Design a protein around this ligand. Structure first.
Ligand code: HEM
Ligand code: HEM
Lengths: 361, 362
């Protein structure tokens, strides 16, 4: 019902994937290093409260009537809902506070990719807060109140709501389906594989940046789907595009979803074949993305897709090689990348005296 | 995650207990062929019966012929009904087609201008709507999407709104949710069990003058933006004065419990509850059924939050219109703005497996 906030790593990466997401990117408006560390400390205290289901500060009510409530109150009466709050630092942040020489080399700028159609307003950002919970209102309440505490020092650059499974009605032992209708997440790094997380996800001290040990690197991509075009393709084109059948999610020529794939039975430009580590030098990713549907656009189409989030030990050896291998993916007919950002995700908050970003500052 | 019965004298999704998620879509009809339109209404109803029971539309989501697109888009496979409801409504603009002019109900009143209005006409109006409510947003989206797909050619989506969480209650035995202003919303509503109050205030009656509408209702949708920056810097006393209830318990001012009856003369002359209360409006009562939304940022460094407000009533002219008029001096006005609007006549329920949506109009 709650997920511990403290640890060697930040929660919300290897911890169980919650039902809903509210992802927020912030831009820093202050030049004062001290004012910013002060904010980071205030945020951590508030995050401790929020992840345990308490209001921030003095609470949402019952204080001096002449004062605004410390907490906007829309979460009163709700449970922690497995809220986790993960903070990340964007490349642009390291142009401030004299941190230029402390940018990790592993936090590489993404190249341009064939087909990219990036909306500059929903891209990048100085920092991010990933808010995962089973209740969308708990997640939003977290983002809202963190933005309120930071007003005057950070502004909200862009924001994205997402949903995955609804765990009160869907079994834990069941792969969710994305909005194209295929099972999503079958071949992924699991939170249980400590060895795989150490190899592919967590920054090692010998990786070159000491203050990032225990951290990870995050790639965010807002990926629109062309729903109405996808929905007119035959059942067979859809299955050809991924290399798995729609119903069971089995690799072509196998019987069960979790049969290991035989890559040569797939079409050379099938998604799974091109994304598989065997096609990419062993490059392996922890995917933790969410579906989104924001409404309908100007021509009556559904503005929906996948808010793709990947964690990895080094952007140069994780996302970048695999995304590059998708240049000729058959899926590309049906999707379009319209938003992008990278963040260095610092190590965890070790105890009640620690704070977000303490190793960097 | 059980199913809600599709068949009834009334459409589900009104007096029904309020489900967690909303996906509301308004459609414009692009066909002139009345017969084409009736066939669509029949096909939509057949799809709805599957969808509300948790079944794939048509022949299913896979295992049909390889060379043909699957009948169901597939993203709801293996999910429970999730209390899905599908509620349909006809906008006034529809009665200018298929020779329905004479049949437009008198209670399908057009709304006047209200002070403060700033209605975006692209996200307003519409020939008809489908209100999709469920506890799982993937289920709600799958129903809209698949309904939109079946209607390709004869209807298109004029605008849609998702609500990520409810701000209304038709079950006063369960906890009242809060809106994005932090207040409990829905304490003094109409409960799905109060048969008397639903007949008196929500269901259209035969004598009301439109026979095909008997058993149906009238729906007002108002998209309402909240100025949360302004609100979040107001004192707690300011906030509690705006409504007339306290923030924590949600009790009428001066009283101790959420559900104690308000004593209106103890509230400010411009408190929201005082002005909205039926005693202040000649007994007018609404069924509120709204949902919160947030659509990203406003591009000015802030979250964009609001409330998608839905009211069902027996006659718009005796329901929303007088209560909205009385809010002209509401203290809440300083913190909100109405930015979208639409009215719909909601037909009666689908009686059985042989009936269909709008059969009493067509
Ligand atoms: C709308 C966009 C996308 C959709 C719908 C999608 C969908 C899928 C599906 C259905 C699978 C098979 C089941 C699974 O193992 O999860 C899969 C596998 C995978 N995808 Fe994607 N994907 C998308 C974008 C991407 C991107 C941008 C990347 C990397 C840059 C990526 C990397 C992978 C990887 C590594 C696998 C596991 C392959 C394996 O080892 O079997 N996907 N994806
Ligand atoms: C964002 C806009 C609005 C907010 C935040 C809001 C909030 C509230 C709150 C906190 C209450 C007290 C608790 C309750 O009994 O539900 C309430 C009651 C009520 N509101 Fe609003 N409301 C809004 C818009 C409207 C509109 C547009 C109408 C009608 C046009 C309306 C009509 C009513 C009514 C009839 C009641 C019940 C009053 C009673 O009988 O005690 N509200 N609302």
């Amino acid at each position: 019902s709650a997920v511990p906030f403290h640890g060697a790593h930040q929660a919300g990466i290897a911890t169980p994937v919650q039902d809903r997401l509210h992802f927020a990117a912030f831009d820093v408006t202050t030049e004062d290093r001290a004012a910013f560390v002060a904010l980071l400390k205030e945020w951590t205290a508030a995050a401790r409260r929020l992840t345990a289901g308490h209001a921030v500060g003095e609470g949402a009510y019952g204080g001096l009537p002449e004062a605004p409530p410390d907490d906007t109150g829309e979460a009163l009466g709700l449970k922690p809902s497995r809220l986790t709050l993960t903070i990340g630092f964007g490349p642009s942040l390291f142009t401030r506070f004299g941190l230029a020489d402390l940018r990790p080399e592993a936090l590489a700028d993404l190249p341009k990719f064939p087909g990219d159609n990036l909306d500059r307003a929903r891209s990048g950002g100085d920092l991010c807060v990933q808010a995962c919970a089973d209740d969308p209102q708990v997640a939003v309440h977290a983002i809202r109140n963190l933005a309120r505490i930071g007003f005057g020092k950070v502004v909200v650059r862009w924001s994205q709501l997402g949903f995955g499974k609804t765990s009160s009605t869907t079994p834990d032992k069941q792969t969710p389906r994305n909005l194209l209708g295929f099972k999503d997440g079958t071949r992924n790094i699991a939170g249980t594989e400590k060895d795989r997380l150490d190899r592919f996800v967590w920054a090692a001290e010998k990786d070159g940046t000491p203050w990032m040990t225990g951290g990870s690197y995050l790639v965010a991509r807002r990926i629109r789907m062309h729903i109405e075009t996808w929905d007119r393709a035959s059942l067979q084109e859809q299955e050809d595009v991924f290399g798995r059948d729609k119903g069971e999610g089995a690799p072509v020529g196998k019987a069960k979803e979790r049969d290991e794939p035989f890559l040569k039975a797939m079409k050379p430009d099938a998604h799974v074949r091109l994304a598989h580590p065997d096609s990419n030098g062993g490059a392996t990713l922890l995917r933790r993305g969410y579906s989104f549907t924001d409404g309908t656009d100007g021509l009556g189409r559904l503005d929906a897709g996948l808010f793709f989030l990947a964690y990895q030990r080094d952007i140069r050896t994780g996302f970048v090689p695999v995304q590059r291998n998708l240049a000729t993916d058959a899926l590309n007919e049906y999707i379009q990348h319209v938003g992008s950002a990278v963040f260095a995700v610092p190590p965890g908050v070790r105890d009640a005296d620690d704070w977000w970003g303490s190793t960097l500052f």
